[PDB]
A paper describes a structure:
Here we use a geometric deep-learning framework operating on protein surfaces that generates fingerprints to describe geometric and chemical features that are critical to drive protein–protein interactions. As a proof of principle, we computationally designed several de novo protein binders to engage four protein targets: SARS-CoV-2 spike, PD-1, PD-L1 and CTLA-4. Guided by these general principles of molecular recognition, we introduce a protein design approach based on the critical importance of the fully buried patches of the interface to drive protein interactions. Overall, our surface-centric approach captures the physical and chemical determinants of molecular recognition, enabling an approach for the de novo design of protein interactions and, more broadly, of artificial proteins with function.
To test our fingerprint-based approach, we sought to design binders to target the PD-1–PD-L1 interaction, which is central to the regulation of T cell activity in the immune system. We used MaSIF-site to find high-propensity protein-binding sites in PD-L1 and, unsurprisingly, the identified site overlapped significantly with the native binding site engaged by PD-1. The second lead design, which uses the same seed but is based on a different scaffold, DBL2_01, could not be solubly expressed and we therefore designed a combinatorial library to improve expression and binding affinity. From this library, we isolated the variant DBL2_02, which had six mutations, and expressed it in Escherichia coli. From the six mutations, three were predicted to be in the interface (Y23K, Q35E, Q42R) and improved binding affinity by forming additional salt bridges with PD-L1. The KD to PD-L1 determined by SPR was 374 nM, more than tenfold higher than the native ligand PD-1. To experimentally validate the binding mode, we co-crystallized the designs with PD-L1. Overall, for both designs, the structures showed excellent agreement with our computational models, with RMSDs of 0.8 Å and 2.0 Å for the overall backbone and 1.0 Å and 1.9 Å for the full atom interface for DBL1_03 and DBL2_02, respectively, showing a very high accuracy of the predictions in the interface region. The chemical composition of the designed interface is similar in both designs—around 59% of the surface area is hydrophobic and the remaining area is hydrophilic for DBL1_03 and correspondingly for DBL2_02. Whereas the native PD-1 uses a β-hairpin to engage the site, the designed binders do so through an α-helix motif, illustrating the ability of our approach to explore outside of the structural repertoire of native binding motifs.
Residue numbers in the entry:
A (entry chain C): 4 to 99
B (entry chain A): 18 to 227
Write the structure that this text describes.
Amino acid sequence: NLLTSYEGSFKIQLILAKLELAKAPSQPLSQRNEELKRVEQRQDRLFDLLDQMDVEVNNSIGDASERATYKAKLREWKKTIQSDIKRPLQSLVDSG
Amino acid sequence: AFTVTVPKDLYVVEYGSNMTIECKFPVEKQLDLAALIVYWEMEDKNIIQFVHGEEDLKVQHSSYRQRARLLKDQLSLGNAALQITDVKLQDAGVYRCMISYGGADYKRITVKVNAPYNKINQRILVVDPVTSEHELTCQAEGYPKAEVIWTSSDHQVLSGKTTTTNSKREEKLFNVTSTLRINTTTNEIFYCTFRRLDEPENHTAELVIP
């Protein structure tokens, strides 16, 4: 299934981005200045993943009982991205 | 806590060999394959995406089509091992392993690719049998620019022409060809020694006149 490939990719990128924000302060300033941009790439990738999963959700099997259920999961994940990634990222670009 | 252990941060890999970099994670009692997620990437290139016990080959980069492998027999031993076949110069860099088994953590490994002048091809052709003028030729392939030192058992150090070219079989590494044109005798032993500009130890081939 295509949607499972999307679920795996999204979960991996989310965990990796959170860990890169956690390990950034314990890293050389020179080495970290690019990692902060890499997190921005991962951040944009997560939004593209959710927006594309929306297409595959309706194009895949199921009904409205599944449609609303999956999109509610996607809304919770969307707020997860903004709370755990983007907001903490801007609190690191300000330092320095 | 969940930490990923790396047996060695620096891997120096010879050119043309296979590379097996390891990242270890704690396994208790058994391997919950459903909850294990392994991810390998180099310089923003998807190498391995292992979720729910199934590899994701469709997301894999084209350059890593059938070169990378995840040794699944080692997964039960708490060791996710990445194997790459036919190591080239472009494989040098920082590899990132992310492991999610309960907890989650990622680690970095720096890979340096060595391309020594190990394979030395030789030929001895006769130019003028009257004056016993022979041409000795030594050709080797490696990346750091190299020069050839021609030595003999009797005449000791002689002199030869060394050239730098681009390779035809593989990457931008150079194919160094040196020719010594001298008048020699039967069973006189000659040596060609490849010494690059960089640090690695030299390699020498032996030529015997027929």
